[PDB]
């Protein structure tokens with residue numbers, strides 16, 4: 196049965212990780228990482244998370260299955276984060292949330308749900324996007340088409356090209372939007388650009404799918420949800436796939452949510468029964484530990500305050516590194532404009548380096564980025580900034 | 592998009608659970624449960640598990656993502672449980688294991704892997720089986736066909752009918768086998784019957800898929816794996832979907848494994864790269880907490896000893912309830928043979944009651960079973976046995 200199976204493509208990131216590990220130079224710096232790292236180069240368990248885990252160890256009396264949609268309190272806290280406390284969508288019971296194994300799990304549940312229960316055949320994704328978006332949608336039998344996004348000259352959002360690309364989308368296609376901290380570019384629509392897109396989406400009959408993996412990493416929890424909320428004010432229907440992997444440092448516990456919105460309670464409940472059926476046929480019901488930690492924190496004033504500050508600390512360190520990176524490049528004689536780095540949001544930016552400059556950086560200097568030139572600014576520290584920038588200058 | 596979606600069928604078990612909760616009779620007994628319960632009616636967290644969770648709280652320094660296939664030690668301990676320490680399959684590196692979100696997650700990964708990378712179109716499942724088997728395989732685009740299994744007259748394995756049904760299976764079809772504690776019947780092949788099936792499967796060109804959700808609940812860890820090991824001795828290729836939900840009381844933490852076996856190392860590694868691709872496009876990588884608890888326990892002599900005894904306690908309580916149930920029915924004047932209950936394995940048996948007797952039991956006596964007459968013997972206790980049996984006698 197298996198004798199003729201073709202191997203899956205490697206698999207950079209791991210290929211990159213492995214090369215990085217093997218490298219014996221002093222010296223070496225990994226900007227190809229996917230996770231947050233603090234100033235010491237560590238990805239620690241958040242203090243709010245450790246405190247919550249201690250409470251659960253003391254208080255849990257069973258591991259009996261969660262419902263298919265997971266912990267009720269998790270769903271309620273999630274909807275408040277997404278839509279705002281006192282949202283009409285919440286008041287009118289137009290939203291249903293399933294706790295899922297991570298953001299990826301939420302995307303796959305949305306995809307299986309749409310493929311099985313609707314006429315959706317196609318999902319529109321930005322060029323560029325997270326490479327796994329295509330894999331997820333294709334796995335559910337959905338075609339993926341790309342829309343223009345990145346202006347490689349100004350390092351900004353090519354808004355005209357975006358709108359023009361999307362005119363090819365038909366009524367009933369899904370359009371995927373990154374809620375904030377666009378991956379890989381860090382370029383997000385302004386609120387006014389979000390509002391323009393919300394109106395266009397209504398007129399064109401698109402089903403919005405928000406991917407919200409970085410809430411809190413751009414400006415703050417509420418501000419990062421402005422775009423989503425602009426859409427939610429205008430649309431009868433939408434889906435949100437959110438993730439707590441980065442903003443709770445809960446990567447490996449697989450903590451996400453798929454939130455389904457419909458015109459009214461009756462309709463969302465009926466549609467959600469089929470979303471639950473898609474979950475049941477996949478992993479049955481979701482992993483408790485990570486989501487219970489999230490619900491415990493979000494629903495407790497003391498823990499929530501500690502967590503909000505820890506998230507602020509991450510957002511602030513990232514922004515400080517963006518600033519230090521631009522200043523240091525200027526100081527090491529880059530002599531070209533990297534100011535775009537300050538205005539971009541979250542962990543990731545395109546450096547503007549070519550694929551060959553990236554290969555040179557790795558081979559000659561032991562500085563590792565993704566082949567596209569995407570760098571994780573949380574791999575930068577005050578201590579590694581100077582040699583990092585000296586290397587970059589050397590390949591320009 | 593969602594206005595015309597048809598609701599998913601309810602959903603017994605929850606429908607059953609809800610009726611049970613609403614019932615105001617003293618009095619009431621739920622045998623429709625899916626989980627183990629101890630003599631007090633509780634599903635506690637195992638002591639070995641609490642101890643492991645304490646160690647992880649003290650020792651974890653990151654939640655950084657696991658690899659796509661999860662924790663290496665988990666995979667190694669899993670293969671030893673399945674195949675036996677010193678197995679040729681292990682020595683020859685013919686097996687690769689992905690940690691998955693539960694047994695269901697392992698089944699879906701196996702199904703997506705097969706649908707995408709092989710000529711498999713069809714999976715053969717026993718009649719009866721766990722109802723979610725059909726849903727999982729169909730979700731991946733695979734047809735499900737049934738093979739005969741249950742002799743409703745003798746309450747035994749209709750081995751002739753099984754073999755005759757399976758002659759309709761073509762070379763390259765998958766045949767699903769429950770490793771031990773067949774669900775819902777508790778009827779397992781003898782070792783000699785397993786050996787006969789192993790030889791037939793080789794001759795007919797079937798790909799065996801073992802579903803192993805109850806290892807340790809029939810006779811013991813090693814004995815429960817005899818059937819699987821008989822197949823593994825004969826086959827170049829097979830898949831095992833196993834679950835630790837019941838034998839570790841880790842239901843909600845979603846702890847399972849998909850183990851792929853091929854003729855040799857080169858072949859399994861190549862095939863496994865595509866299994867990892869199927870995982871990546873689904874939930875990306877698996878939840879750490881539950882599997883880390885399992886690996887911690889299995890790899891530590893002291894914790895493993897405590898856990899093995901806790902599992903023995905569960906297996907023994909189940910067998911005691913089977914015995915008490917048969918004795919009590921005889922004593923309450925059932926006056927028909929229920930001896931089959933003693934010989935069946937695990938939590939579940941068909942009582943032999945009709946759908947109408949089951950409905951009567953619930954309406955008149957507040958005794959709840961699944962509509963098929965399947966009962967969970969772990970819902971029985973020395974204290975509830977007499978009224979349970981009095982009710983059953985009353986509907987015969």
Ligand SMILES: Cc1ncc(COP(=O)(O)O)c(CN)c1O
Nearest residue numbers: 297298299325378408438440875
């Ligand atoms: C845009 C985007 N979508 C979703 C994901 C997947 O998140 P998770 O690791 O929670 O599955 C990521 C990675 N955090 C991402 O960058």
Ligand SMILES: Cc1ncc(COP(=O)(O)O)c(CN)c1O
Nearest residue numbers: 479693694695721774804834836
């Ligand atoms: C035969 C069978 N297969 C697999 C499963 C699913 O197991 P899990 O809850 O770990 O997903 C069950 C329920 N334990 C089952 O009875």
Ligand SMILES: *c1coc(C(=O)O)c1
Nearest residue numbers: 228229230325378440
């Ligand atoms: C978090 C997990 O993966 C990423 C990535 O960009 O691949 C972020």
Ligand SMILES: *c1coc(C(=O)O)c1
Nearest residue numbers: 624625626721774836
């Ligand atoms: C464990 C989870 O579900 C069952 C069932 O029979 O449905 C057992």
